[PDB]
């Protein structure tokens, strides 16, 4: 139904790798847990991130800042046996911190409002001038410990969504703006090759990107990036073991993505970078949708499109490794990880694999498909379907002309949906055990893995037709490229002389 | 000084493997560490250590005690998330847990008290029927988990040094009595072939030993072994960063041993087996007597003679992974481990692996010395001299006669003493850095292992005779095997035709 002619020649776009500039994460304590470490390398390993974007680098599971008593002195000590084992393991997986400056450690807090199950401190320090000296002793180490060549290329963003009054006391824009201030201006001093930025509010308070930008331009405080994060889920209904969310089209997050862009440019700095430091549907830890193929359908577009506006685009998280709503309590629970315990992926993970396929010269793309060529001139693309009703249209058909010049093609296809790459359903069809067997997790890992077929033909008038219908919530990659047939040199080659019917 | 003649054919005792029965750790819920799967695997590799104990199974941080509210009903829930990825990890790397039940879950208790810097909850439960449960609900899930024949395996330790006011209220010994009573009876009702047993107390207060055995006696309360810790530690001196402890001899360890036996063999259960769950000199996280080459040569003497009297004795601990008093602050801190961060084997490390080398067969054995014979009629001997004071005597002198019906024999020794294989005097030299570099990490690892020294004796009137002498704090161990040569089957073998002058 959805026909498609490429013309030979014509692009009409870059699509460029932000989409796999960041990536979210557990608290930074809950980095020394080898199933993160396991988790993360095996991410690493499909999905070339750079950066890692996680809370609670200051909270005190971390231990960094504590407190001794000399005489009827308390003198500070400064503690980096933890972080440096977790940014070592970092950098030599291949990925670097995006630093996120927070919470409030527990012995410089002026009040005890927490956020979390793991009780990390938002209230603003009692001392500004201690947590001046806090922040450049971290920074300082680092720079001794990694050198500057290493740490400049590490961002630094302040706070977490300060316009919320769970994640900061009173959500006091100038408290923050305060603390924006004193923090930056610590970096900077230790090395003002480090970039930094904020003020990584949640949608909802756009006002305060205006008045966090004049703030920093009326004073002289620097800002080198702009956060915010993006989520499309409406107001959320509760259960012990449960948070069940209905989700806004994703159209809401890239127009979200642009008006946001617009902001900027009417800005006092029109050419500020933007992280989008956290992404998804819901936005609980325990929403079974982040579990589903339609997950992976419905974010797909941001993959695709995300990149026209910000410089990044951060998913929440890779990993099940979480415990902002305390331990998961079964093996598919609703957490934010591309990957379930165990490294087994979810639908949404296949889905980001597939952008590894995407040249940078755009053949093509509407709001479901995205057609590229990459450099060895063979094409790739990749489409969605998300399907958020019963009633909706459920599938989607395709008919697209590729032209080829070349006389046989190899054609390979990838695709999950419900069917294939849903180990949800099967995990369901076990019984929706919550702690299960080895073997229960052996057989979800046959199954987490996308349907791969592949087809050869003679290309006949210059151009080849792929015909091929989505079902519900499906992704699917195709690989077009081209065949130096070597039979001629197999002498005596005839298949019809092998047993089988050949 | 010491003159010893070993006479042809001659045995006393047999040392037996106790001493690698078990060993200690770091809470369970740090059993999630990266860097604790690493050290362990490490320790696995040199080590065949069949047993592992460790606090807070039932710590809050494991969480598998949790209530729901539906209704205003409170319902409870078990999640053993953390605990099966725990238990799988240790059998993985084919160790067993010694499985301490405690401490308090936090909506279990019954008042405010905790121990240690993470806080667990050391008063008893509040409803003792719903501690039943938990108990039934967590021996039940290991069994659907790893399957009878497995879990029947692990023993089953109730509490620990209930006698201490600081790991239970009050130090309350009837309250004890019926929280040993309840769990063992749920333990049992789920399996009676689950081997439990306590009362796990700390030193100087050995007349609980008798009041618990005659307690279960008269009331028919199962217990299938004894537990009961050790350490030599006088009281301590408390400093910010440190705590600084003299010891008694290592004698009055070894007596405590054969103490406990004789109380088991004055009880209603004569033939106790008796596991000391923990021991060391030192018992403090923070302090540097366990870095040393001195303890390693002073716990030496345990190894060899400790089996004579209790059927195993698990050093507290395996690693530095460790929590107790908070993140460690410096790579050598007076951790309890064998083994530092960043898998830096200490002294007291190298001294457990010599005891591989020791088979059943003992030839001779006094304070200073055991002289085994192997399977193959080889004999290795592992001397040590612990120095306490510099005054004391320093050196310790040895002339060995050993017997052997073979012509050419082949000696190898393995030293370590405060010149070799002592990582710690190498790190104070580097400044003693608390976060130090890869650089200076892996040079410590070269410094860190025993010097290896070979020996080639034709042998004159049927015995060899071994001279050698003892610094302080030295521990070392010989291999004596036979020679076959080889040489005469070289044709032209020249060596004084190799330029070098050979
Ligand atoms: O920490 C995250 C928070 O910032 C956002 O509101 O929702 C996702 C949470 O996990
Ligand atoms: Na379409
Ligand atoms: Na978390």
Not at 153 to 178: C, G, H, M, R, S
Not at 197 to 203: H, K, R, V
Not at 479 to 501: A, Q, R
């Given at each position: ?16 790798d932000?989409w ?33 974007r ?9 231990g ?24 070592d ?12 400056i927070?919470f409030?450690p ?14 990390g401190?938002?209230?603003?320090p009692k ?21 500057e ?9 302040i ?17 923050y ?19 930094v ?10 006002y ?11 004073n002289?405080?620097?800002v ?6 993006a989520?499309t ?26 008006t ?6 009417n800005?006092?700095?029109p050419?500020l ?17 982040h ?28 990993s ?10 079964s ?10 315990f ?27 498909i ?34 080829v ?10 695709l ?8 949800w359903?099967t ?16 057989t ?13 033909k ?27 047939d ?16 050949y």
């Amino acid at each position: 139904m959805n026909h498609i002619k490429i013309e030979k020649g014509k692009y009409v776009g870059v699509f460029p790798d932000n989409w796999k500039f960041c990536v979210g994460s557990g608290r930074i304590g809950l980095a020394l847990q080898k199933e993160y470490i396991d988790a993360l390398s095996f991410v690493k390993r499909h999905i070339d991130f750079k950066y890692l974007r996680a809370h609670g680098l200051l909270h005190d599971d971390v231990g960094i800042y504590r407190e001794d008593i000399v005489d009827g002195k308390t003198i500070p000590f400064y503690n980096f046996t933890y972080i440096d084992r977790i940014y070592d393991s970092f950098l030599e997986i291949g990925i670097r911190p995006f630093v996120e400056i927070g919470f409030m450690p527990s012995k410089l807090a002026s009040g005890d409002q927490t956020v979390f199950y793991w009780r990390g401190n938002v209230t603003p320090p009692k001392d500004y001038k201690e947590w001046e000296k806090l922040i450049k002793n971290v920074v300082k180490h680092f720079i001794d410990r990694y050198g500057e060549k290493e740490v400049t290329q590490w961002p630094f963003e302040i706070w977490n969504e300060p316009n919320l009054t769970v994640f900061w006391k009173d959500a006091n824009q100038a408290e923050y703006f305060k603390l924006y201030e004193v923090t930056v201006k610590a970096i900077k001093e230790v090395n003002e090759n480090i970039k930094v930025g904020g003020p990584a509010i949640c949608g909802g308070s756009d006002y305060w990107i205006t008045d966090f930008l004049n703030f920093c331009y009326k004073n002289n405080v620097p800002v080198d990036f702009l956060t915010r994060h993006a989520y499309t889920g409406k107001p959320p209904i509760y259960t012990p073991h449960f948070v069940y969310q209905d989700v806004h089209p994703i159209e809401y997050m890239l127009n979200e993505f642009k008006t946001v862009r617009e902001m900027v440019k009417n800005s006092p700095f029109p050419n500020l970078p933007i992280h989008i430091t956290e992404f998804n549907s819901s936005y609980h830890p325990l929403c079974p949708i982040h579990d589903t193929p339609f997950n992976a359908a419905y974010l797909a577009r941001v993959l695709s499109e995300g990149g026209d506006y910000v410089d990044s685009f951060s998913y929440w998280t890779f990993s099940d490794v979480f415990e902002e709503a305390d331990v998961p309590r079964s093996l598919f629970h609703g957490g934010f990880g591309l990957v379930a315990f165990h490294n087994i992926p979810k639908p949404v993970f296949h889905m980001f694999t597939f952008f590894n396929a995407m040249g940078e010269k755009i053949l093509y793309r509407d709001d479901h498909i995205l057609i590229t060529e990459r450099e060895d001139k063979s094409v790739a693309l990749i489409a969605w379907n998300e399907v958020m009703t019963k009633e909706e249209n459920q599938e989607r058909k395709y008919r697209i002309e590729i032209p080829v010049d070349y006389k046989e093609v190899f054609i390979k296809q990838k695709l999950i949906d419900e069917e294939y790459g849903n180990p949800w359903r099967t995990w369901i069809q076990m019984g929706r055990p919550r702690f299960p067997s080895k073997k229960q997790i052996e057989t979800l890992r046959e199954v987490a893995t996308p349907k791969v077929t592949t087809f050869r033909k003679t290309v006949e008038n210059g151009h080849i037709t792929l015909e091929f219908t989505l079902g519900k919530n499906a992704v699917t990659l195709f690989e077009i490229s081209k065949v130096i047939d070597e039979s001629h040199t197999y002498i005596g080659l005839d298949d019809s002389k092998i047993p089988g019917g050949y």
